[PDB]
C-alpha cells in the first residue's frame, strides 16, 4: 500500500502551446512517492517521521514542442519548467507546510522549485530525495488508546509549472491523501 493521489485545481492549470499557436496534447503525469509514508493501521492514515526523509518521484510525458504558456493574458513565451512540492493543512487548505531538503552534512535547506528540463517527445524522470515537512501535525498523541479526536493531517502537493515572464503556471498538480507527520 503507497499514498494515493489526485489531480489537483485541474480546472485552473494553463496549456502549452507549439510553434504554430495549436494547443499541444495534455502532458502525462505520474506522481509516486517512493519512501518515507507507512499506512498505520491504528491511525487508518499514513504516517511519516519528520526526522526520516521521503521522496517523490515525478514522470512527465512531453508530448510535443512546447513554447506559449496560455495564460489568463492570453499566450506568452514559455522561460522554463519547474517542480514544486508543498504540503497543505487538511483542516486550512490554503495555508502551506514548507519542505526541507536535507543535505550531506544533516543541514536542512528550503526546498524551492527545481528546475527541470523537458525534452519534446520523451518521459522525463525527476527524483526529489531527501525531503522532509518543516513542520509537524498538530495534535498526534492518542488519548487512551484511541487516536486523537481532533489529530491533524498534511496532504502532498507536487506540482509541474512553466515560468513565462516573471510568473509561474501550474500545468499539472496532484495532491496526496492525508498524512500524519511525528516528531
Same mark, same amino acid.
Given at each position: 500500500?503507497?499514498?494515493?493521489?489526485?489531480?489537483?485545481?485541474?480546472?485552473?492549470?494553463?496549456?502549452?502551446?507549439?510553434?504554430?499557436?495549436?494547443?499541444?496534447?495534455?502532458?502525462?503525469?505520474?506522481?509516486?512517492?517512493?519512501?518515507?509514508?507507512?499506512?498505520?493501521?491504528?491511525?487508518?492514515?499514513?504516517?511519516?517521521?519528520?526526522?526520516?526523509?521521503?521522496?517523490?518521484?515525478?514522470?512527465?510525458?512531453?508530448?510535443?514542442?512546447?513554447?506559449?504558456?496560455? $495564460?489568463?493574458?492570453?499566450?506568452?513565451?514559455?522561460?522554463?519548467?519547474?517542480?514544486?512540492?508543498?504540503?497543505?493543512?487538511?483542516?486550512?487548505?490554503?495555508?502551506?507546510?514548507?519542505?526541507?531538503?536535507?543535505?550531506?552534512?544533516?543541514?536542512?535547506?528550503?526546498?524551492?522549485?527545481?528546475?527541470?528540463?523537458?525534452?519534446?517527445?520523451?518521459? $522525463?524522470?525527476?527524483?526529489?530525495?531527501?525531503?522532509?515537512?518543516?513542520? $509537524? $501535525?498538530?495534535?498526534?498523541?492518542?488519548?487512551?488508546?484511541?487516536?486523537?479526536?481532533?489529530?491533524?493531517?498534511?496532504?502532498?502537493?507536487?506540482?509541474?509549472?512553466?515560468?513565462?515572464?516573471?510568473?509561474?503556471?501550474?500545468?499539472?498538480?496532484?495532491?496526496?491523501?492525508?498524512?500524519?507527520?511525528?516528531?
Amino acid at each position: 500500500q503507497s499514498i494515493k493521489w489526485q489531480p489537483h485545481q485541474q480546472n485552473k492549470w494553463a496549456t502549452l502551446y507549439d510553434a504554430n499557436y495549436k494547443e499541444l496534447p495534455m502532458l502525462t503525469y505520474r506522481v509516486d512517492a517512493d519512501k518515507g509514508f507507512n499506512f498505520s493501521v491504528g491511525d487508518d492514515a499514513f504516517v511519516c517521521q519528520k526526522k526520516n526523509h521521503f521522496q517523490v518521484t515525478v514522470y512527465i510525458g512531453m508530448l510535443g514542442e512546447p513554447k506559449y504558456v496560455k $495564460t489568463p493574458e492570453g499566450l506568452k513565451p514559455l522561460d522554463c519548467f519547474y517542480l514544486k512540492l508543498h504540503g497543505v493543512k487538511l483542516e486550512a487548505l490554503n495555508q502551506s507546510i514548507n519542505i526541507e531538503q536535507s543535505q550531506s552534512d544533516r543541514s536542512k535547506r528550503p526546498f524551492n522549485p527545481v528546475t527541470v528540463n523537458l525534452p519534446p517527445e520523451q518521459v $522525463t524522470k525527476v527524483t526529489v530525495g531527501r525531503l522532509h515537512f518543516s513542520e $509537524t $501535525t498538530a495534535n498526534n498523541m492518542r488519548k487512551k488508546g484511541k487516536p486523537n479526536p481532533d489529530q491533524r493531517y498534511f496532504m502532498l502537493v507536487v506540482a509541474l509549472q512553466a515560468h513565462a515572464q516573471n510568473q509561474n503556471y501550474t500545468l499539472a498538480a496532484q495532491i496526496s491523501e492525508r498524512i500524519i507527520v511525528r516528531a
